[PDB]
Scaffold this active site. Structure first.
Site, PDB file in Angstrom:
ATOM      1  N   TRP C 183       0.798  -1.227   0.000  1.00 46.24           N
ATOM      2  CA  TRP C 183       0.000   0.000   0.000  1.00 46.24           C
ATOM      3  C   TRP C 183       0.826   1.271   0.000  1.00 46.24           C
ATOM      4  O   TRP C 183       0.285   2.352  -0.242  1.00 46.24           O
ATOM      5  CB  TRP C 183      -1.002   0.022   1.181  1.00 46.24           C
ATOM      6  CG  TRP C 183      -0.368  -0.235   2.520  1.00 46.24           C
ATOM      7  CD1 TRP C 183      -0.351  -1.419   3.203  1.00 46.24           C
ATOM      8  CD2 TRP C 183       0.374   0.696   3.323  1.00 46.24           C
ATOM      9  NE1 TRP C 183       0.339  -1.285   4.382  1.00 46.24           N
ATOM     10  CE2 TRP C 183       0.796   0.002   4.481  1.00 46.24           C
ATOM     11  CE3 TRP C 183       0.707   2.053   3.186  1.00 46.24           C
ATOM     12  CZ2 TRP C 183       1.541   0.610   5.493  1.00 46.24           C
ATOM     13  CZ3 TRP C 183       1.455   2.665   4.206  1.00 46.24           C
ATOM     14  CH2 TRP C 183       1.865   1.933   5.340  1.00 46.24           C
ATOM     15  N   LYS C 207      -2.677  -8.208  -7.623  1.00 48.67           N
ATOM     16  CA  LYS C 207      -3.419  -8.177  -6.367  1.00 48.67           C
ATOM     17  C   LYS C 207      -2.952  -6.939  -5.587  1.00 48.67           C
ATOM     18  O   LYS C 207      -1.927  -6.990  -4.911  1.00 48.67           O
ATOM     19  CB  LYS C 207      -3.138  -9.472  -5.578  1.00 48.67           C
ATOM     20  CG  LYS C 207      -4.324 -10.035  -4.752  1.00 48.67           C
ATOM     21  CD  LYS C 207      -4.832  -9.085  -3.663  1.00 48.67           C
ATOM     22  CE  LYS C 207      -3.799  -8.859  -2.550  1.00 48.67           C
ATOM     23  NZ  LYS C 207      -4.262  -7.880  -1.516  1.00 48.67           N
ATOM     24  N   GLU C 210      -4.968  -4.090   0.155  1.00 44.41           N
ATOM     25  CA  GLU C 210      -6.306  -3.716   0.602  1.00 44.41           C
ATOM     26  C   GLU C 210      -6.489  -2.209   0.819  1.00 44.41           C
ATOM     27  O   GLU C 210      -7.544  -1.649   0.472  1.00 44.41           O
ATOM     28  CB  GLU C 210      -6.637  -4.469   1.895  1.00 44.41           C
ATOM     29  CG  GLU C 210      -6.804  -5.984   1.720  1.00 44.41           C
ATOM     30  CD  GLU C 210      -5.536  -6.795   1.998  1.00 44.41           C
ATOM     31  OE1 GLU C 210      -5.676  -7.950   2.467  1.00 44.41           O
ATOM     32  OE2 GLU C 210      -4.409  -6.292   1.761  1.00 44.41           O
ATOM     33  N   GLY C 240      -5.267 -10.511   1.134  1.00 51.61           N
ATOM     34  CA  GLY C 240      -3.957 -11.127   0.893  1.00 51.61           C
ATOM     35  C   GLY C 240      -3.904 -12.601   1.252  1.00 51.61           C
ATOM     36  O   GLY C 240      -3.544 -13.445   0.421  1.00 51.61           O
ATOM     37  N   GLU C 288      10.542  -8.849  -2.212  1.00 47.15           N
ATOM     38  CA  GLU C 288      11.293  -7.674  -1.844  1.00 47.15           C
ATOM     39  C   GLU C 288      10.638  -7.113  -0.589  1.00 47.15           C
ATOM     40  O   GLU C 288       9.482  -6.695  -0.603  1.00 47.15           O
ATOM     41  CB  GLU C 288      11.345  -6.700  -3.028  1.00 47.15           C
ATOM     42  CG  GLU C 288      11.958  -7.363  -4.290  1.00 47.15           C
ATOM     43  CD  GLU C 288      13.424  -7.789  -4.115  1.00 47.15           C
ATOM     44  OE1 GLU C 288      13.797  -8.905  -4.547  1.00 47.15           O
ATOM     45  OE2 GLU C 288      14.188  -6.984  -3.557  1.00 47.15           O
ATOM     46  N   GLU C 417      11.284  -3.731  12.067  1.00 49.13           N
ATOM     47  CA  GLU C 417      10.754  -2.684  11.192  1.00 49.13           C
ATOM     48  C   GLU C 417       9.438  -2.126  11.747  1.00 49.13           C
ATOM     49  O   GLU C 417       8.417  -2.816  11.751  1.00 49.13           O
ATOM     50  CB  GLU C 417      10.574  -3.222   9.779  1.00 49.13           C
ATOM     51  CG  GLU C 417      10.249  -2.135   8.778  1.00 49.13           C
ATOM     52  CD  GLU C 417       9.941  -2.657   7.392  1.00 49.13           C
ATOM     53  OE1 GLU C 417      10.402  -1.988   6.440  1.00 49.13           O
ATOM     54  OE2 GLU C 417       9.242  -3.695   7.251  1.00 49.13           O
ATOM     55  N   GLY C 477      13.963   7.483  -1.933  1.00 52.53           N
ATOM     56  CA  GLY C 477      13.672   8.048  -3.244  1.00 52.53           C
ATOM     57  C   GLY C 477      14.592   7.587  -4.365  1.00 52.53           C
ATOM     58  O   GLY C 477      14.868   8.362  -5.282  1.00 52.53           O
TER      59      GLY C 477
HETATM   60  N1  LIG Z   1      11.729  -3.998  -0.598  1.00 52.29           N
HETATM   61  C1  LIG Z   1      10.892  -3.112  -1.140  1.00 52.29           C
HETATM   62  O1  LIG Z   1      11.106  -2.578  -2.407  1.00 52.29           O
HETATM   63  C2  LIG Z   1       9.673  -2.625  -0.413  1.00 52.29           C
HETATM   64  C3  LIG Z   1       8.927  -1.588  -0.978  1.00 52.29           C
HETATM   65  C4  LIG Z   1       7.728  -1.176  -0.410  1.00 52.29           C
HETATM   66  C5  LIG Z   1       7.292  -1.805   0.743  1.00 52.29           C
HETATM   67  N2  LIG Z   1       8.034  -2.818   1.296  1.00 52.29           N
HETATM   68  C6  LIG Z   1       7.576  -3.452   2.532  1.00 52.29           C
HETATM   69  O2  LIG Z   1       6.182  -3.647   2.558  1.00 52.29           O
HETATM   70  C7  LIG Z   1       5.715  -3.579   3.900  1.00 52.29           C
HETATM   71  C8  LIG Z   1       4.496  -2.665   3.933  1.00 52.29           C
HETATM   72  O3  LIG Z   1       3.593  -3.102   2.943  1.00 52.29           O
HETATM   73  P1  LIG Z   1       2.257  -3.932   3.343  1.00 52.29           P
HETATM   74  O4  LIG Z   1       1.866  -3.566   4.732  1.00 52.29           O
HETATM   75  O5  LIG Z   1       1.324  -3.835   2.182  1.00 52.29           O
HETATM   76  O6  LIG Z   1       2.868  -5.423   3.428  1.00 52.29           O
HETATM   77  P2  LIG Z   1       2.090  -6.816   3.626  1.00 52.29           P
HETATM   78  O7  LIG Z   1       3.122  -7.865   3.654  1.00 52.29           O
HETATM   79  O8  LIG Z   1       1.207  -6.849   4.811  1.00 52.29           O
HETATM   80  O9  LIG Z   1       1.182  -6.933   2.318  1.00 52.29           O
HETATM   81  C9  LIG Z   1       1.704  -6.865   1.001  1.00 52.29           C
HETATM   82  C10 LIG Z   1       0.717  -7.512   0.024  1.00 52.29           C
HETATM   83  O10 LIG Z   1       0.651  -8.909   0.276  1.00 52.29           O
HETATM   84  C11 LIG Z   1      -0.704  -9.288   0.529  1.00 52.29           C
HETATM   85  N3  LIG Z   1      -0.692 -10.368   1.514  1.00 52.29           N
HETATM   86  C12 LIG Z   1      -0.820 -10.305   2.883  1.00 52.29           C
HETATM   87  N4  LIG Z   1      -0.735 -11.568   3.367  1.00 52.29           N
HETATM   88  C13 LIG Z   1      -0.552 -12.430   2.328  1.00 52.29           C
HETATM   89  C14 LIG Z   1      -0.381 -13.826   2.247  1.00 52.29           C
HETATM   90  N5  LIG Z   1      -0.197 -14.570   3.344  1.00 52.29           N
HETATM   91  N6  LIG Z   1      -0.196 -14.400   1.007  1.00 52.29           N
HETATM   92  C15 LIG Z   1      -0.183 -13.630  -0.150  1.00 52.29           C
HETATM   93  N7  LIG Z   1      -0.349 -12.258  -0.064  1.00 52.29           N
HETATM   94  C16 LIG Z   1      -0.521 -11.679   1.154  1.00 52.29           C
HETATM   95  C17 LIG Z   1      -1.402  -8.033   1.003  1.00 52.29           C
HETATM   96  O11 LIG Z   1      -2.789  -8.146   0.813  1.00 52.29           O
HETATM   97  C18 LIG Z   1      -0.718  -6.995   0.119  1.00 52.29           C
HETATM   98  O12 LIG Z   1      -1.291  -6.985  -1.175  1.00 52.29           O
HETATM   99  C19 LIG Z   1       6.871  -3.063   4.742  1.00 52.29           C
HETATM  100  O13 LIG Z   1       7.501  -4.142   5.384  1.00 52.29           O
HETATM  101  C20 LIG Z   1       7.809  -2.510   3.693  1.00 52.29           C
HETATM  102  O14 LIG Z   1       9.160  -2.459   4.083  1.00 52.29           O
HETATM  103  C21 LIG Z   1       9.212  -3.241   0.743  1.00 52.29           C
END
Ligand SMILES: NC(=O)c1ccc[n+]([C@@H]2O[C@H](COP(=O)([O-])OP(=O)(O)OC[C@H]3O[C@@H](n4cnc5c(N)ncnc54)[C@H](O)[C@@H]3O)[C@@H](O)[C@H]2O)c1
Ligand SMILES: NC(=O)c1ccc[n+]([C@@H]2O[C@H](COP(=O)([O-])OP(=O)(O)OC[C@H]3O[C@@H](n4cnc5c(N)ncnc54)[C@H](O)[C@@H]3O)[C@@H](O)[C@H]2O)c1
Ligand SMILES: NC(=O)c1ccc[n+]([C@@H]2O[C@H](COP(=O)([O-])OP(=O)(O)OC[C@H]3O[C@@H](n4cnc5c(N)ncnc54)[C@H](O)[C@@H]3O)[C@@H](O)[C@H]2O)c1
Ligand code: NA
Ligand code: NA
Ligand code: NA
Lengths: 516, 516, 516
Positions: C183, C207, C210, C240, C288, C417, C477
């Site tokens: 998100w 996908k 949310e 997810g 990632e 984190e 950035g």
């Molecule tokens: N390394 C990178 O380039 C990078 C970039 C942006 C964000 N992030 C990381 O993302 C996190 C924040 O994003 P978030 O809160 O959306 O992360 P999240 O892991 O909670 O969710 C990411 C996505 O995965 C889905 N998801 C959740 N549970 C799942 C499951 N068990 N199986 C398959 N899909 C599932 C979610 O619905 C969402 O679409 C932070 O940890 C941040 O560091 C990393």
């Protein structure tokens, strides 16, 4: 497509027992095959006709090497329909696929090289090494054009970008064209003129020379085995002034690829400039015509080296080459030493049936014999006959190596292409006069200079106005890739065979812009 | 030579007060000079004649914009001698030196751009932006060809090496040729056709269109100031069928570079195919001829964008462009929405004296007015007149933006190049039929497609058979370097201007081997 | 395809009245559309469902910004069938055609940038510049991958030739895969992860998170208008652990492209290693994940520059970045000067409704607010709270910029984190110890060093073990093309986005030999 870097196919000299053994067997099998009949090839099938073309053995013209079918207007029309139908899909083949087809054809030709050489020996009177050079050059054209075509692949054009747009320029083939070929290199030039245009997506109707129809058919056997799609290549042995002219003049022929005499090339180029009724394009015609090629020797040259190269250049394949040295231009200091050496070498040349691997076989036909002998008669009243000048005994068309000396630069025998074993020797004061005399003909195909003087060589590089110039070596036998081949002036349109530029002649460019 | 990477000269839009002030000043200077007489330019000097050519202001044809000398056969002979004499040494200039000369000419032209634009406005009735585009394109040709010529410099050809030899292939210029130019882009095309051949070492006799002799002379003022050696470029205003034909048919003319009508191009190409008495080469002729260009719009398009692009393409410079949209091909779903928008936009276009920067100036001459009005009469019998179709009030040759609908694809107005502000609208079933209708003319120069459907665009990329195709934008105004310009079929010989390939057309190749 | 060299889309700073006016207009249009419902997008059409997802304004969570359809197993199956069906033909598009499709999508996105930014402001609480950076990065991914994909075009592989054979190696796309997106960059990362695989011929089921379903739908509006063939891209907003996990575990999913939390990434990578019943390949999964990113400052640094960069890095988008500085590691000589400056700057930061362009908007959700507040409670037990640490007044999820000092390197707040505006300050003896502390986490995504000492910078270049390291500037950035983005260790699989290498991850290689 990744293949080994291009290399020229080695020319067999038949110095090993293995090579001699293979050549003897090939000659025997071709001889045993005399009288075979070969049909037309139209739209992927062999198609026979009622009328026929007869191909004689110039070493023994009572012997029929073979016959082919004979294409008239109806067969030309069938070939046009097949070629245009094929063009629709052949043009859309990936270049890699078309290039692979050429490489397959080259592999098949290489495996039949002794047979093709033997066919040249019997059909057009080449000795063994001349026959080998011809077939090797054909293989070279296929190998070279297969690779060169990849350099034009979608989208090949270097353009300047513009904000907010894609700008894409690319080449496309022209369509169906006619290839009209000579008898003197009826494997090499026949093959090159067909496969170049075909490589990049054109389709071709091929008209072999009357005197070389059998070996043209054997080339088509290779194309058929390689698996060119129906209509991509078509084989129309027939009469040049009839079916050849019919195709040249046709509103639905897109391009003409011609190699042959100036007389014919002039007619073809003029006809190509005309809009036939219903024609919807400007025809492209490439005409690669004759020469009156000179070797200059100055007083600084290696005279023995010069004499050998002059004899090879003047008398190889009986002087029946567009590249043959028909003029020997000697400065005052070079005159006696070079002429004496040339006469001594030339008087030792053997002449006989091509199968015997003589230095000279026969000239190709009764008509060619008549023309060469006629020029010899003309020459007797223009210059001084100092060697040969006679038909030799035998049924075959054997003419002795001939030399005229003290020939005036403007004499008919110093200006007109004789295309036989007839060398005209011209005596000049110095290198400046040598260049003046060299340049003063209507032609501009090949030329040579024997000289150790750097300033004379570099002067000739700048001012000896021929398309293919050679220093301290023979002026015949331009190699594919190494020496882009083609002339200036009335030696033709400068379509450089065996060069990257050749394929561009058979493409047009489209530029497509999308504003996003 | 190292210069900045090529960029296109920006086209002035006159949105600033300074640009408008500069244009008014230029218009004033130019009209103050309406009395001027411009001689021929031969062998580095201005040479006058007894007879003269008169140039009129098409916006006020009782007003003379200038007079020039008039070249006949004697002057053509003088120019030939000058051009061949110059060729002998000009061919030997280092390419870097010739390219610098072009760059100087470009700098001089850029400094005179407002004067040249104003001359276009008054002499050929271009509005301000059309005039600016024309001059900018001329500058582009000079800048582009100066740089492109270095890509051909000694020894440029990629050849395969051979043991014990140097093999060196390189390009040389052809000789003296004739450039025969149209009135519709009489700075841009006149300049490009001259400086391309000249850049690589040819010399040129330039024959401007009768309707554009004054601006052609001003281009020669620039060449003269730049310091082209005497005889390298020559200016021969005169009558096409007289001095133009004389040079085309001449045995000592080496090549012809022509842009103009199909009618004239056909005669030139035919004549070029003939061996004139005493001629010693096969002439090269490049003929870039007309179009019957279509824009296709399908039901997925942005109809407002399409309508704007159609109106620009159809009516820019009064439709007097080889690239102008003269056919609008609409699928059934696009028909009413696009036609309504095209009509609404076209009905708002202003027509009047070109100096007032109207949307449309006048057509170029009484003869052009006659031709366009005659086609309007034919169109009234073939389709439905829905807009314009009338001469407008005043001495100037003002014709209203014209639209015919319900035009059969085989109608004369759907097939023949009208070269005026006349758009023919053709309704088709679907995209396939749109492409069929687009392709079914004798021509193949420009085309466009407005569509959001990727498959339709990419289908057109492969099958809309025109040399210059544009998606979702106007089909006119090809930029040098960005969009190689030239067509297929009876739109000419596909000499792609503003492309690397263009200069190759004016070169021949020599191959020189030294065996050490 | 020839387009201008890649350049990054400029990030709007809103310093002009026109830009501010345009933003206000966009914000108004977007809020007027808060009532909108956006279906799924499957097989080229919008497809609705019974159940729905609701998206809230984190600055005013009683305000609904939009609703979408909700994908379950049946919809996942429908999307799979569509994506595999499309793959069969999409894989065969010329690369130039696929790249043009991307370029069209980029042009459409650029035309809608203010609308997308405003949607980010309202849906995920980005301030104006954070929103602009996100959309600009999305455009960059499309422009960059469009161009990069051409570097892989048929046949791209460098192989060693072999006699008598063509050997040709080339890339092909994998098939249909799933993209599961976060998100926090729901235009940029959502777009990049989709268009990279798609560019080279894969098909994708996307996908969105949310919390960012509305803006994801708007991206799909752009894809639809661009005209991606049916099934090439599919939009499946949903839960997810339900539809996301279902696709991850599916035997017919060929690859998974995931960006998100470590917790989820670990589950995905583990599942991807398993052969689901009937699966016929080894799944590729790119995950990632998060970071615990540090900036080191030593006593040689420009302390004012360091403090500004630290505050930008720690508090930009409320610290909700995988790249955000969550640790500040200060050598003894840097400690007081830098901490004093960081506190002075951080205490001046504004927090409020994102549409007012505060320094900080709200965190994204009640769940995120809960997580961040819980970590603040943990931090109070581990370090010393010196700034912020409180929820601020209002329904929106406003949290004050927070600083803890005296934080042990192994503290939970120094290791885990937090993903909110919480900076942990760690005092170390010298640069060596700073590097030790920097490296001693499970993560390895971004890092920075402020120092004037060359040897310290170059030491960090070699030994500060993070995928994206920055000297004397902010650590957030990363720009597409300039800074290949991706980490080491538990920051994920090092799939470097905005780099040539990225597309290779979505290709496999075939080697084809033909013996002639
Ligand atoms: N390394 C990178 O380039 C990078 C970039 C942006 C964000 N992030 C990381 O993302 C996190 C924040 O994003 P978030 O809160 O959306 O992360 P999240 O892991 O909670 O969710 C990411 C996505 O995965 C889905 N998801 C959740 N549970 C799942 C499951 N068990 N199986 C398959 N899909 C599932 C979610 O619905 C969402 O679409 C932070 O940890 C941040 O560091 C990393
Ligand atoms: N420049 C070169 O690369 C090159 C190479 C080899 C041979 N040649 C020249 O070819 C000539 C010898 O070959 P040739 O005797 O076969 O030449 P030719 O001109 O008599 O015939 C060549 C071909 O053209 C056909 N032909 C004849 N009249 C025709 C017509 N009016 N319309 C269409 N086709 C017609 C013939 O049937 C044959 O296929 C010599 O002048 C030689 O210099 C030139
Ligand atoms: N393909 C292109 O790039 C392109 C560009 C511009 C214009 N055009 C075409 O040019 C035409 C309009 O130009 P125009 O009216 O000046 O054309 P035109 O054919 O009447 O004249 C062109 C030039 O040829 C000369 N000319 C006329 N008759 C001649 C003859 N028999 N022999 C030698 N020269 C002769 C004229 O004096 C003039 O200099 C249109 O058909 C247009 O499509 C084509
Ligand atoms: Na024979
Ligand atoms: Na005029
Ligand atoms: Na939200």
């Amino acid at each position: 497509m990744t293949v080994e870097p291009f290399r020229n196919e080695p020319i067999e000299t038949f110095q090993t027992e293995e090579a001699r053994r293979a050549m003897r067997e090939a000659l025997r099998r071709v001889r045993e095959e005399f009288g075979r009949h070969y049909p037309l090839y139209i739209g992927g099938e062999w198609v026979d006709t009622k009328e026929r073309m007869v191909s004689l053995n110039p070493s023994a013209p009572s012997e029929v090497v073979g016959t082919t079918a004979k294409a008239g207007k109806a067969e030309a029309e069938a070939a046009l329909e097949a070629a245009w139908k094929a063009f629709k899909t052949w043009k859309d083949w990936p270049q890699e696929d078309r290039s692979r087809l050429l490489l397959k054809a080259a592999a098949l030709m290489r495996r039949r090289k002794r047979e093709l050489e033997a066919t040249l020996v019997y059909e057009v009177g080449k000795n063994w090494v001349e026959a080998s050079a011809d077939v090797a050059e054909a293989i070279d054209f296929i190998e070279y054009y297969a690779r060169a075509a990849l350099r034009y692949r979608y989208p090949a054009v270097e353009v300047v970008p513009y904000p907010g747009e894609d700008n894409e320029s690319f080449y496309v083939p022209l369509g169906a064209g006619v290839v009209i070929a000579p008898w003197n290199f009826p494997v090499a030039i026949f093959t090159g003129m067909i496969v170049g245009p075909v490589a990049v997506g054109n389709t071709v109707i091929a008209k072999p020379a009357e005197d070389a129809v059998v070996v043209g058919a054997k080339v088509f056997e290779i194309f058929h085995e390689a698996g060119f799609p129906p209509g991509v290549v078509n084989f129309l042995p027939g009469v040049g002034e009839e079916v050849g002219a019919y195709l040249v003049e046709h509103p639905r022929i897109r391009f003409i690829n011609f190699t042959g005499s100036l007389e014919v090339g002039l007619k073809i180029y003029e006809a190509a400039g005309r809009l036939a009724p219903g024609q919807t394009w400007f025809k492209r015609a490439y005409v690669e015509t004759g020469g009156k090629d000179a070797i200059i020797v100055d007083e600084t040259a290696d005279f023995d080296l010069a004499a050998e190269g002059v004899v090879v250049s003047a008398y190889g394949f009986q002087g029946q080459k567009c590249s043959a040295a028909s003029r020997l231009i000697l400065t005052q200091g070079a005159y006696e030493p070079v002429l004496e050496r040339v006469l001594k070498r030339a008087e030792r040349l053997s002449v006989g049936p091509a199968e015997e691997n003589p230095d000279l076989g026969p000239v190709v036909s009764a008509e060619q014999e008549r023309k060469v002998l006629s020029y010899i008669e003309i020459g007797k009243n223009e210059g001084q006959l100092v060697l040969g000048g006679k038909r030799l005994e035998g049924e075959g068309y054997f003419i002795a190596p001939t030399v005229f000396t003290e020939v005036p630069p403007k004499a008919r025998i110093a200006q007109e292409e004789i295309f036989g074993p007839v060398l005209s020797v011209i005596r000049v004061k110095d290198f400046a006069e040598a260049l003046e005399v060299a340049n003063d003909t209507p032609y501009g195909l090949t030329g040579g200079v024997y000289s150790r003087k750097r300033e004379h060589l570099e002067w000739a590089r700048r001012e000896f106005h021929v398309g293919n110039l050679y220093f301290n070596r023979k002026i015949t036998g331009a190699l594919v890739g190494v020496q882009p081949f083609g002339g200036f002036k009335l030696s033709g349109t400068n379509a450089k065979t065996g060069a990257l530029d050749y394929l561009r002649l058979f493409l047009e460019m489209k530029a497509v812009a999308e504003r996003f």
